[PDB]
Every structure is written in C-alpha cells, then in structure tokens.
Design an enzyme around this catalytic site. Structure first.
Site, PDB file in Angstrom:
ATOM      1  N   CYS A 188      31.547  18.368  33.139  1.00  0.00           N
ATOM      2  CA  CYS A 188      31.060  19.650  32.490  1.00  0.00           C
ATOM      3  C   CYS A 188      29.887  20.246  33.264  1.00  0.00           C
ATOM      4  CB  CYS A 188      30.817  19.424  31.022  1.00  0.00           C
ATOM      5  SG  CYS A 188      30.611  20.891  30.040  1.00  0.00           S
ATOM      6  N   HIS A 244      32.434  22.620  34.319  1.00  0.00           N
ATOM      7  CA  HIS A 244      32.683  23.656  33.331  1.00  0.00           C
ATOM      8  C   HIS A 244      32.693  24.991  34.060  1.00  0.00           C
ATOM      9  CE1 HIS A 244      32.377  26.321  29.895  1.00  0.00           C
ATOM     10  NE2 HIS A 244      32.882  25.289  29.224  1.00  0.00           N
TER      11      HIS A 244
END
Length: 190
Positions: A107, A127
């Site tokens: 992420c 992400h």
C-alpha cells in the site's frame, strides 16, 4: 519436516490495521513464526482506524533476534512515514537486502523502501495514491499488478490485495502447495 521460517512485521503508529493483521494471520496459518515488532517499543500501537494492537516485542529486541526469512512493512500513510523516518528500519532493511532475504511491503509501505534506498531498479506496485511518492526520482519501475515480485522485492497495492500479498509471501517461503492449502479455507473469491 520443511525448513522453519520466520517473519518480522514492523508495526508503527498509524499502520493500516487490515494490512497488518491479514499478513500476520495468513503467515501464522502457514506455520511461519511471526514476530509483530513495535517500532516505538512494546507498548500497544494505535493503528490508522484506531484498532489498538499489542506487539509481541519491541523492534529494539526483535532486531537482535534475527535474521528473518521475510521483513514485512504494512502500509497506512502515517505508518509508512514512521517506517521511513526510522534508522532502525533502515538498518534492518539494508541487512535483509544484503543477505538476499525477502522484503515485502504493501500500500504506502513500499515508500519506506524509497526512503531507505532499498531495491532500486525493481518493478514495484503501491496503492494508486502512493505512486507519485514512490516514483519520485524514477528509482523503480511501476506496476499495476495486484501483487508484484521482482527478485526479493515483493509489493502490493491495498487492503483489498492483502490476502494475495500474504499468500505470495507464503508461496515464496513455503512453496505453492502450502500457499494453496492455506488459501482454501479462507473463502476467497478466486
């Protein structure tokens, strides 16, 4: 039977609790000995959405009990910032890279690889919202794969890729068959 494996999960204030717990749980299902190590010490950690997790150990102690087969960096924007600012994290990641050990980050987590100059020239994902930070300087090649792996650098995109990330770690350490056996009871969509 198979070689015993060990994972270090570095848990900082502001970590994404789903990206912490899913890999810890899935790796323990795989028989990996996982140490959840608090960046700041042994005190409970307030994650991004206010889940409070008690670490197994301080990072200070855990770092002295390596080496580990994988070092795992959860995401969470503030958690990853904390990881990025830590000299202890820098030293752990440099040692792991030197040892040719797996490094896994999800992420915003991969941005701590940039901060500590780890794995330059690899394909990575993050992400979507963390791409620009990760790509500052062009030190990695960006991927939109849900999980990416280029040698010892294993990355993934978000809460919703956490199971895939975790199972990729399992596959890398314990093989495809163990990963498939761990996956089946989870009731994943595919």
């Amino acid at each position: 039977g198979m070689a015993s494996k060990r994972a270090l999960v570095i848990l900082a204030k502001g970590a994404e609790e789903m990206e912490t717990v899913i890999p810890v749980d899935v790796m323990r299902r795989a028989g990996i000995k996982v140490t959840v190590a608090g960046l700041a010490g042994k005190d409970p950690v307030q994650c991004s959405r206010d889940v409070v997790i008690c670490p197994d150990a301080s990072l200070e102690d855990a770092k002295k009990e390596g080496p580990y087969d994988v070092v795992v960096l959860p995401g969470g924007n503030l958690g990853a910032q904390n990881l990025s600012e830590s000299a202890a994290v820098k030293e752990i990641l440099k040692e792991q890279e030197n040892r040719k050990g797996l490094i896994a980050a999800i992420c915003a987590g991969p941005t701590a690889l940039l901060a500590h100059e780890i794995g330059f020239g690899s394909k990575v994902t993050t992400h979507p919202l963390a791409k620009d930070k990760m790509m500052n300087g062009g030190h990695y090649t960006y991927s939109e794969n849900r999980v990416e792996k280029d040698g010892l650098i294993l990355t993934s995109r978000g809460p919703g890729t956490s199971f895939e990330f975790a199972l990729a770690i399992v596959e890398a350490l314990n093989g495809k068959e163990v990963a498939a056996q761990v996956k089946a009871p989870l009731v994943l969509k595919d």
